[model samples]
Target: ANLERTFIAIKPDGVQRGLVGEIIKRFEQKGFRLVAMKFLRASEEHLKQHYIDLKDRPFFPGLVKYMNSGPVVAMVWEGLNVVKTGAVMLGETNPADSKPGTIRGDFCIQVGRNIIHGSDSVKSAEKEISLWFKPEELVDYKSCAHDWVYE
Candidate 1:
């Protein structure tokens, strides 16, 4: 099986509302390993670079502002199919479109203030994780229960 990793961020809203632990619990319970994490304020440059794909869109400026408004909890999650599955857990970027039980659905009220961010694809997962973290920042350790979770 291919071992995949993805980035997940508890955005400003999530952190401000003290839902970081709750969000992390969901991922851990879903069998993804926590490889790295950091709580920090996002710089303008970092947000600009990270969301470059949204540059052509009109909401780009506001997106940057909201992202930099407060400290966010960034994380790297590793497991099989995490990029795809994690997005499902996160729900649609637009809270109104997300189904109940999804992170955004449960915690957010609007698209602009979604509570979390997850890599939308494998390529995006790699790009996001690398941009926000250094190699040394990530840790690897054996989990005694790994065999029960993965094939």
Candidate 2:
């Protein structure tokens, strides 16, 4: 598989709920590399761009508020099809529909307050990566584990 990268963020609810370490552990155990990370309160402008497509929706205000309520853990992960697989690892958008063993299924409860976000596609990954990390901020080293996981 060709290498790829994706964005992953631990939402405010996840931080408030004390699931940051566990959530990050999942990705590490799944063989993805953590290329970049930031622990800080999301700026309004940052949040706006993150969910820009939802700006016209009725829930926009509440959504933005929720995202900015506290510090979020923004991350960049690299692997094969990491975007889609990461979402699967996180389970359904609504915890009610999440399967057991998934992050959302076991650690989350509400749809709006779901603990994590994974880039939904390759294009989305590129956009999100740029949103969170500048070129200099993303480390570009490699791992010996790569050979064990991909073709």
Candidate 3:
């Protein structure tokens, strides 16, 4: 892909723990451009709709509840292969298995409290971005540092 977009979220625990700036800094320094972002206290209905594919899973109910417990930082970041790269950045679901530089590896512990989320695939990234934002909400622009960031 030439340019890609990925949906990433800082969950309630990360927000409550005041890790937003630390997390954003990682993305910023990584050279990916932020296309859209916002703070939201998502409703259970919305969460359910967003995680529709996982609705049948056993922990789906509790997943929605925990996600609804506090505000989350919803974001869309753009770059070359951002969907996969951002997933690597966010680290594994089980933080114990994550590498030292990954977000979860550096900042989180449990699977349930991993503190961040990233679209697992490009298809999912597109869908998640659609669910979280309108087209107009995602600004298209030429970054001044674009030449410096990518080959």
Candidate 4:
């Protein structure tokens, strides 16, 4: 069986605004499995490494600051086409550019305040998962819906 995984995060604003459960519900309802999770404020260094690809951009410093403003929910979801499916759920980096039914589209109004993050690609998902979780931390379990969700 080939199971895809994606790293998803609910930023501080989302946590502070109490969207954590609501967000998780969507992913779970969509039949993705929760493999790992943590609620904590990450170090600037850790976040920097996570977003290192964007380090050269002008907003990098402020972006890092905003991320550290409060606690975040870091998670790994596993299922078929998770990275790509999760991307659609997260919508665009700019809420203005997002579609109505998407997470960003429905909840946010600003670009900088966009409240969610999802790995941009499967390669990035692999990198982000390692950055955020330990091998042992990713526990495995069989879901009742596993067979129902896939062929």
Candidate 5:
């Protein structure tokens, strides 16, 4: 793949903790371009589809509840290897196992309260971006800093 795009979201706890700026800053500093973003209170329907793969898990209901508890920042970021890089920035899904420099490790305390969600792979990124956003919601443009960031 050439330039890539991935889905990322700041969970309710992250927003409540006022870490949105910090989260965005990390992605920006890592050279990913913000392609789209929205702040909204997630509905059960949306959360259901977003986490559909986890629907069979025992924690699924609670997961959905937490996601819908407050407003979340849903975003799309563009760059080379953003799927993998975004996951690194998000840290391990279980904050307890995350490394110190990672987002979850730095900002969260538990798996249930992990600060953010990022696409785990390119396939998931495609599926997630489609699930969470309409085509028109994603803006395509050239970033002035792109030349400086990419060779």
Candidate 6:
């Protein structure tokens, strides 16, 4: 079907603030399919690996600590061009730069407290989905409205 999938996580702040339903709604309204989902407190090991690319940055420790501070919702969404579309839906990494219709722009005011994480590219999505979920965890099925969503 040439479907693409992307990884998205509602950060600790988003969970605490009860924005998970709204966040998921945005994706659903945009015609993406939820392939997998999990809610759990992040382990230091998981956070470290998840943000490994940022390890050299000065804020790495703080970032790790914040991610581990509470429970998060991790998800995998599937659809066409989901990597790019998900990024747009998630908004800019820094909330200040996000536009009003985006998730971060509407719900967040600071980069440090940005409410979500979405894989920035196809390569990133591939790595992240595998890192956070096992192959068996992702479900594959036909959506009833697939024809309506895809040409």
TM-score of 1: 0.96
True lDDT of residue 19, candidate 1: 91
Over 34-149, each residue of candidate 3 has an lDDT whose tens digit, in order, gives 99999999999999999898999999999999999999999999999888889899888899999999999999899999999999998888899999998899988888999888
- In model 2, the runs with Cα more than 4 Å from the true position are none
Q: Tens-digit lDDT track for model 2 on 44-146?
A: 8889998999999999999999999999999998888888899999998999999999999999888998988988889999998898888998998777887
Flag regions of model 3 displaced more than 4 Å.
Answer: none
- Across 1-151, the per-residue lDDT of candidate 1 in tens digits comes to 3379999999999999989988999998988889999999999999999999888999899999999999999999888899999999999999999999999988889887898999989999899988999999999976677989977
List model 4 lDDT by residue over 9-49, tens digit each. Answer: 99999998889998999999999999999999999999999
* C-alpha lDDT values of all predictions: 0.92, 0.90, 0.93, 0.93, 0.91, 0.93
**How well does model 2 score by local distance difference test?**
0.90
Q: What's the TM-score of each model vs. the native? A: 0.96, 0.95, 0.96, 0.96, 0.96, 0.97
**Lowest summed lDDT window (length 10), candidate 2:** 142-151
The residue ranges of model 4 lying beyond 4 angstroms of the native Cα positions read: none
Q: Which stretches of candidate 5 lie above 4 Å from their native place?
A: none
Q: Model 1, 10: alpha-carbon shift in Å?
A: 0.8
**Candidate 6 structure quality by residue, lDDT tens digits, 1-151:** 4489999999999999999999999999888999999999989999999998888999999999999999999999998899988898888999999999999999999999999999988989999999999999999988888889988
lDDT of 6 at 113: 97
Candidate 1: where is the Cα deviation over 4 Å?
Answer: none
